[PDB]
Amino acid sequence: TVALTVPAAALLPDGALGESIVRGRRYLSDTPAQLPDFVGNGLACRHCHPGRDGEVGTEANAAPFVGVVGRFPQYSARHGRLITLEQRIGDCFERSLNGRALALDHPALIDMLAYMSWLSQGVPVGAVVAGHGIPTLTLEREPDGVHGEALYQARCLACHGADGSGTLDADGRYLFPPLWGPRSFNTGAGMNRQATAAGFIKHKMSLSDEEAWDVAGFVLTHPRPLF
Numbered sequence: 127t128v129a130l131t132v133p134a135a136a137l138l139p140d141g142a143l144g145e146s147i148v149r150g151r152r153y154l155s156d157t158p159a160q161l162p163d164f165v166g167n168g169l170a171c172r173h174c175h176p177g178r179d180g181e182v183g184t185e186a187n188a189a190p191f192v193g194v195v196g197r198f199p200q201y202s203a204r205h206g207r208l209i210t211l212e213q214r215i216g217d218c219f220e221r222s223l224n225g226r227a228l229a230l231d232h233p234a235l236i237d238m239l240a241y242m243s244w245l246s247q248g249v250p251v252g253a254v255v256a257g258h259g260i261p262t263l264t265l266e267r268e269p270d271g272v273h274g275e276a277l278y279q280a281r282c283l284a285c286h287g288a289d290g291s292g293t294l295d296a297d298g299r300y301l302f303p304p305l306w307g308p309r310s311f312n313t314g315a316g317m318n319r320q321a322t323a324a325g326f327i328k329h330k331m332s333l334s335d336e337e338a339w340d341v342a343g344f345v346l347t348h349p350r351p352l353f
């Protein structure tokens with residue numbers, strides 16, 4: 127593997143590419159507001175792909191975009207064939223954002239690609255970046271949603287809400303995003319999978335493996351949009 131490095135925003139190039147990258151960052155950070163025709167819920171890409179200092183997709187073990195462009199095209203079992211990064215992003219819009227895929231030459235899609243390529247600068251094509259993806263967490267027992275509920279009330283509720291509906295900021299963006307219900311990810315999303323949610327929760331928080339497993343279980347007992 128190669129190390130995860132975040133390029134310096136002050137070294138962004140003048141011109142069309144620099145401008146595109148800046149637009150791309152905003153599409154990823156503010157998706158429902160910027161692309162209402164394509165987003166069906168309250169989630170922005172950054173809600174599962176966080177980054178510090180205004181960037182998106184720069185956190186190890188929270189599916190960073192650093193180095194993602196050199197890993198496509200790649201096989202998808204879902205599609206039964208090779209897919210491009212453009213297509214992967216489309217699946218995210220359809221599942222995680224409960225919406226509609228952007229046309230494969232849509233300027234907003236190309237701006238997102240430009241941003242991801244910027245984050246990937248210096249990464250050799252084919253190389254795997256340390257911290258890529260969301261590492262699954264699987265336990266050898268059923269998740270205990272009763273324990274999970276207690277854990278949720280103690281550790282999660284103050285941000286994500288008694289009803290999982292999250293907390294809106296002053297401008298109507300989710301400060302704390304919804305975990306279930308009609309504004310959350312739909313059943314087709316990767317986050318709807320127990321081991322992926324447990325893994326995400328484990329790495330993005332102070333929780334033991336058993337606690338992340340049980341609280342993920344509790345979260346995923348709830349309704350959400352059907353895909």
Ligand code: HEC
Pocket residue numbers: 154157169170171172173174175189190194197211214215218219222223238258259260261311315316317322
């Ligand atoms: C949580 C509900 C998510 C939201 C909202 C978005 N994404 Fe996502 N993404 C998510 C998971 C759990 C994964 C799998 C991680 C893994 O281990 O493979 C992904 C993956 C991607 C990828 C592929 C990453 C890789 O191959 O390394 C891309 C390019 C991606 N996601 C893009 C993306 C965009 C652009 C989003 C806003 C439209 C977006 N995702 C939202 C979980 C979630």
Ligand code: HEC
Pocket residue numbers: 169172173174175176177278281282283284285286301302303304305310311317323326327330331333341342345
């Ligand atoms: C405020 C201090 C929070 C507490 C406590 C918890 N979460 Fe959270 N979560 C929070 C934010 C701001 C975000 C967006 C990503 C980011 O880090 O910037 C999240 C994201 C999630 C997600 C993915 C997004 C979604 O489904 O909407 C999940 C699945 C999630 N959080 C679960 C979760 C659980 C189970 C918690 C208790 C262990 C928990 N979070 C605490 C803010 C906060």
Ligand SMILES: O=S([O-])[O-]
Pocket residue numbers: 217218219221222223314315316317
């Ligand atoms: O592509 S994910 O949202 O399943």
